[PDB]
Design a protein around this ligand. Structure first.
Ligand SMILES: [Mg+2]
Ligand SMILES: [Mg+2]
Ligand SMILES: [Mg+2]
Ligand SMILES: [Mg+2]
Ligand SMILES: [Mg+2]
Ligand SMILES: [Mg+2]
Ligand SMILES: [Mg+2]
Ligand SMILES: [Mg+2]
Ligand SMILES: [Mg+2]
Ligand SMILES: [Mg+2]
Ligand SMILES: [Mg+2]
Ligand SMILES: [Mg+2]
Ligand SMILES: [Mg+2]
Ligand SMILES: [Mg+2]
Ligand SMILES: [Mg+2]
Ligand SMILES: [Mg+2]
Ligand SMILES: [Mg+2]
Ligand SMILES: [Mg+2]
Ligand SMILES: [Mg+2]
Ligand SMILES: [Mg+2]
Ligand SMILES: [Mg+2]
Ligand SMILES: [Mg+2]
Ligand SMILES: [Mg+2]
Ligand SMILES: [Mg+2]
Ligand SMILES: [Mg+2]
Ligand SMILES: [Mg+2]
Ligand SMILES: [Mg+2]
Ligand SMILES: [Mg+2]
Ligand SMILES: [Mg+2]
Ligand SMILES: [Mg+2]
Ligand SMILES: [Mg+2]
Ligand SMILES: [Mg+2]
Ligand SMILES: [Mg+2]
Ligand SMILES: [Mg+2]
Ligand SMILES: [Mg+2]
Ligand SMILES: [Mg+2]
Ligand SMILES: [Mg+2]
Ligand SMILES: [Mg+2]
Lengths: 260, 155
RNA sequence: UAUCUGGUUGAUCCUGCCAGUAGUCAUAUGCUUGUCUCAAAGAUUAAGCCAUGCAUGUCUAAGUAUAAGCAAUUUAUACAGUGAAACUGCGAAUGGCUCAUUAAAUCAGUUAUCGUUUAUUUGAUAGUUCCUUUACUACAUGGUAUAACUGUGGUAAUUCUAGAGCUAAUACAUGCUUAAAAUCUCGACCCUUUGGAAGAGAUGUAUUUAUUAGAUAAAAAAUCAAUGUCUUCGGACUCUUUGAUGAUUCAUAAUAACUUUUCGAAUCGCAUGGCCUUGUGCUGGCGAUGGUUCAUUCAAAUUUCUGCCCUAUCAACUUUCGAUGGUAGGAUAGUGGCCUACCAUGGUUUCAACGGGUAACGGGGAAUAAGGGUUCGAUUCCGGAGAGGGAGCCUGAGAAACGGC
RNA sequence: UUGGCCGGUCGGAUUUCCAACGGGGCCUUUCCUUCUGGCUAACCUUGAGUCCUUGUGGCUCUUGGCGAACCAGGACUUUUACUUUGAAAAAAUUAGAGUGUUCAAAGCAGGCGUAUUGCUCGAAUAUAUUAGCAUGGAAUAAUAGAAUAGGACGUUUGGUUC
RNA sequence: UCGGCACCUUACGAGAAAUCAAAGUCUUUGGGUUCUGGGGGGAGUAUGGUCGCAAGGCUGAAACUUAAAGGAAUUGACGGA
RNA sequence: GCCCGUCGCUAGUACCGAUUGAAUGGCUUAGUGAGGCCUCAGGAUCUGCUUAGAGAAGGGGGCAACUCCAUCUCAGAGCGGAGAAUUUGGACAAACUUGGUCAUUUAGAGGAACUAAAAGUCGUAACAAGGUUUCCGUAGGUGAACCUGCGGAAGGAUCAU
RNA sequence: GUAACUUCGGGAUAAGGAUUGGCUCUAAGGGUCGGGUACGAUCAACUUAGAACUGGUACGGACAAGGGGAAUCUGACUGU
């Protein structure tokens, strides 16, 4: 023990990175960064396991040390850089802009976007609080501190960050009828906006959400990410829109497109 | 606890940072600080119009109630400003598919707002470690009747 | 894969165990052994002892190069490339190995930090540096004091080092220049009073204390320090800024100070632009690396609730060397009997405390299983403990560290 | 929800034509602790008009409209057990979907052309108990309430505090 | 008719049977609850505690040994029946 | 027929037992008490100023307003810093010595048993009315199985006047 | 702090182990005085506990004053 750990055991990794059990004893430990260790996705996992551009973890080093990848417009040459939720990942060569979003299985989608959507991102307001000299600041889910917000911005909301100058462009208030991206647990990757929100003063606020197919699913408020109004997402949603087709319906589609 | 020996102590018992200005005569003559502990637990009036200090009181003192809220029956009031309450429960053994009576005793700080006694069901709320053992302060006393008005000597 | 069978009798029917029967990711051992895949392996017994060798070092255009090194420069007479050594920084607190302690202890799930520390990461963040301004010192840039090194040595021997002489910094120690306004306090210059003023200082951020604000049920009024800044001198003044949390003495801000005064860049690479007082004048880009605070991230510490094997040939245990609580202090990173001082007499237990045993680390889990159970889990993951035993400590964000003392 | 019969698609959409389950409301003497202000009720109340060929399946600026179709405070709370549902619950293992590792133990791969400028599916889910959190029920098993009435109900006294 | 000590007959049932209206309502296994047993010996022994003036009482082992001990009934055999 | 013991052969297992028997692990009254830390001191050195005394060196506008920052030979009345050995006092506390106590293991002359176990000797106590009906509690007596008193039971050899 | 054993009364001061001076203090522990048809004058005593400071670590400073333990025999004991 005696301090911070520097190693991640494979099979002690978060399961949603889809790392193979064999062929290597260790996992890429997420570095310190904007997102938590179990809620992030290291760049080696993205560029070798999700995009298949690198074969080894050495070619992830040979990519990052040519200033190719940039998370949020900044290069981040760390191999184990903890790129997490809503992070825009730009590749200059290949011209590919990705946004790290959850597919409905609870994993990280290989989801391309375009440049006007790559120019910004979203961030769930963690806290609103006065800083020193009286300056108000808001804290986002990637730990960004942005000063002088709109005074209407409260906790559990969402702000649109301009990502060149890290400025709040506009904000989506947290209220009923607004697209909730569930960001943790078994409901990871599910959209659906509302039923209502139940309070529980004391801890662990719960939010009821019913998707396009009218499936209600209760989620804790600390897994809720607001991503738009009714309809009209503020980002490009992944291939499947977070609907949770059951395995009976999942076997129905794959047989519907394996005979063509 | 407005009267009856607030000061019986080697140190001066006062609330921290509550300045009584002696020049400006405001017609209370002692500023008193209170809060609500939250979660619907009312601040009793005998804390407001009483004058105890209790640095570990959830209303007038510097402890914040947070975490588990439990309920239990007071069994022992023989310390000063502390009680132990009995948390009776049933524990299930799966082999017999049956339950057994277990209990745990929890020592709880009692503020001098309340007048607890034994055999009183009481609501207690977690705080920081008050003592070696105590982590809970009485937030609400749940005694109503006690069946004690019908027992004494008769004509 | 919900199965029984052999054994008591002259014979029978039982109770009943013995024996057979089948697994074992369960060890050892005997015999035998051709192919391919897969692969536990000094746990038990001795956490008993250890020869030898290795297991932790690290250099980019970007802290320091006069190697008396090499290549041999690219106005390159300050250097220019490469770079041993050494200084500086960072790491060495991860890994790995083992299971000896350890029976509400660890651990597992579940709370808490409104009870704290946190390198690194990431995001923000610093016009104030003048001692007592009308007693400022280079900022076109401060100082000594050292390594490596040269040379002279001791010891049989150690990753021992001595004396002398050199020399750098992103090491060490000092120390400035980057507006302008407001608002206070002081202040040479108010006649018959709801009668002021150049100037002089201070006001960044750390520290520590005290005090203040951090608000709120909707509206109306006539008296008494109060013409509270009511203008035809009564033409009732038409007026509330304040974030957060379930909850605060929270965040924050202000007033008076306080300090063996912390920080506020005496640092490096590349590119060499542009402007007009052509002076090597003024502005100038992309970085690197430091730095204060607040959040973040990796953590750490303590923590709520509930749960663990056998034993009463263990029924009372804890309280002089804290037991249980209160009050105050000290210590801590902080809560807290953590310790100290004083005061009270508590706290636990037949719902098994206290004690004793364990060839006991805990859990995920494993073997067998109709169902329920029974037994194992030292061991590929997670948490704990330990490096022969104990105890203490330095450094560092992080260790009571052991490939440190 | 079994479907359920134009069988017109040479025994393959459909639907009150219904019966049995499974829920939600309303009323019968029938709690829904509660006043506030943003809803302005499937509008308790229907000025103005039903240009559709006859019905009990298809509407407007409305006469101040039980401002009661959910957001934060109380003259605000009898407590459990039980059971359902759901989060949150490390992976590996176990059960288990997919997939010719040549089979299998395994593994999480893989599959498909025009193989020339390459297209594309996955990596599910269940269980994971006991304790804790929320949630629907209110049988069963407790507990409490008014008997010396210190009882419950009252929108138009406000006293030593507020 | 209430309660009791028993009995008689049958055996629905129960049991291995002898028998039993309880010893039944028991693989169609759950009314409530206390104590005890786990093949025979060693052995109610050793040791420890405890009680008693003591005799002894209560609690109470293990090593080791053993393939049967036992229960009920049948047929025989034998009886100084 | 079966069967009980006394005594005897061989082998094994535990029990009591002088020996304050021995060994490991504790845990603990006490005494001594290393080392590091903090602390009261200390000051070998190893320096930077500066002198009211020669310190052979202008007082940092200037050698008339008692006003303008000012250094070598040595003692220093002026200081100021770093500081090693050593030392006081604490608190943590290794370890040693001694006693008490707990638990486990191990040695012991000998004593008191049990078993293998069927076989030797002696009687025949039980099983038949087993030749004195048996068994239970208790007491006493006996080579001994046992015998006898007292009370019980029927598992009696009597379900019956 | 205290064992075996015990006639349960003892063994027992078992065995063992710490402290003790001086000075300056602190804290308890009394008596007499009194009410309206929310009170302290006054006097006196030596016990006990605690603290600091102090010293060639001395201190029951002379005096005074048990050695203790494990066994065996023997008589119960006090007594003669
Ligand atoms: Mg490790
Ligand atoms: Mg306490
Ligand atoms: Mg067997
Ligand atoms: Mg071959
Ligand atoms: Mg070993
Ligand atoms: Mg092992
Ligand atoms: Mg072991
Ligand atoms: Mg070793
Ligand atoms: Mg380089
Ligand atoms: Mg290894
Ligand atoms: Mg780092
Ligand atoms: Mg650098
Ligand atoms: Mg205290
Ligand atoms: Mg305290
Ligand atoms: Mg305190
Ligand atoms: Mg062990
Ligand atoms: Mg285990
Ligand atoms: Mg284990
Ligand atoms: Mg360690
Ligand atoms: Mg370090
Ligand atoms: Mg160590
Ligand atoms: Mg190590
Ligand atoms: Mg080692
Ligand atoms: Mg298979
Ligand atoms: Mg009758
Ligand atoms: Mg037996
Ligand atoms: Mg017995
Ligand atoms: Mg005995
Ligand atoms: Mg005979
Ligand atoms: Mg006879
Ligand atoms: Mg007979
Ligand atoms: Mg018998
Ligand atoms: Mg003595
Ligand atoms: Mg003696
Ligand atoms: Mg005599
Ligand atoms: Mg005689
Ligand atoms: Mg005699
Ligand atoms: Mg005599």
């Amino acid at each position: 023990a005696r301090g911070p750990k520097k190693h991640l055991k494979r099979l002690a990794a978060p399961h949603h990175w889809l790392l193979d059990k064999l062929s290597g004893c260790y996992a890429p430990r997420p570095s310190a960064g904007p997102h938590k260790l179990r809620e992030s996705l290291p760049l080696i996992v993205f560029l070798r396991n999700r995009l298949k551009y690198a074969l080894n973890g050495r070619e992830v080093k040979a990519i990052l040390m040519q200033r190719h990848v940039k998370v949020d417009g900044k290069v981040r040459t760390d191999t184990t850089y903890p790129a997490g939720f809503m992070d825009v990942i730009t590749l200059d060569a290949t011209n590919e802009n990705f946004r790290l979003v959850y597919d409905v299985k609870g994993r990280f989608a290989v989801h391309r976007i375009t440049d006007e959507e790559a120019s910004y991102k979203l961030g769930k307001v963690k806290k609103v609080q006065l800083g020193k000299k009286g300056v108000p600041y808001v804290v986002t889910h990637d730990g960004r501190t942005i000063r002088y917000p709109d005074p209407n911005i409260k906790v559990n909301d969402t702000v649109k960050i301009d990502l060149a100058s890290g400025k709040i462009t506009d904000f989506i208030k947290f209220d009923a009828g607004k697209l909730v991206y569930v960001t943790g647990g078994r409901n990871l990757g599910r959209i659906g906006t509302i039923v209502h929100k139940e309070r529980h003063d004391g801890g662990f606020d719960l939010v009821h959400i019913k998707d396009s197919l009218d499936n209600t699913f209760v989620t804790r408020l600390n897994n809720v990410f607001v991503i738009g109004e009714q309809g009209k997402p503020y980002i490009s949603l992944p291939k499947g829109k977070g609907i949770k087709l059951s395995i009976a319906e999942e076997r129905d589609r794959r047989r519907a497109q394996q005979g063509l | 606890s407005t009267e009856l020996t607030v000061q019986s102590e080697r140190a001066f018992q006062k609330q921290p940072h509550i300045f009584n200005n002696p020049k400006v005569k405001t017609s209370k003559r002692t500023k008193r600080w209170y809060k609500n502990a939250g979660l619907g637990f009312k601040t009793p009036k005998t804390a407001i119009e009483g004058s105890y200090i209790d640095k570990k009181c959830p209303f007038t003192g510097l402890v914040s109630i947070r975490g588990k809220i439990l309920t239990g029956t007071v069994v022992s009031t023989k310390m000063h400003r502390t009680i132990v309450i009995r948390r009776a429960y049933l524990h299930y053994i799966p082999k017999y598919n049956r339950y057994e009576k277990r209990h745990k005793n929890v020592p709880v700080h009692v503020s001098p707002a309340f007048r607890v006694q034994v055999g009183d069901i009481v609501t207690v709320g977690q705080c920081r470690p008050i003592s070696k053992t105590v982590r809970f302060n009485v937030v609400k006393v749940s005694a109503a009747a006690g069946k004690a008005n019908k027992q004494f000597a008769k004509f």
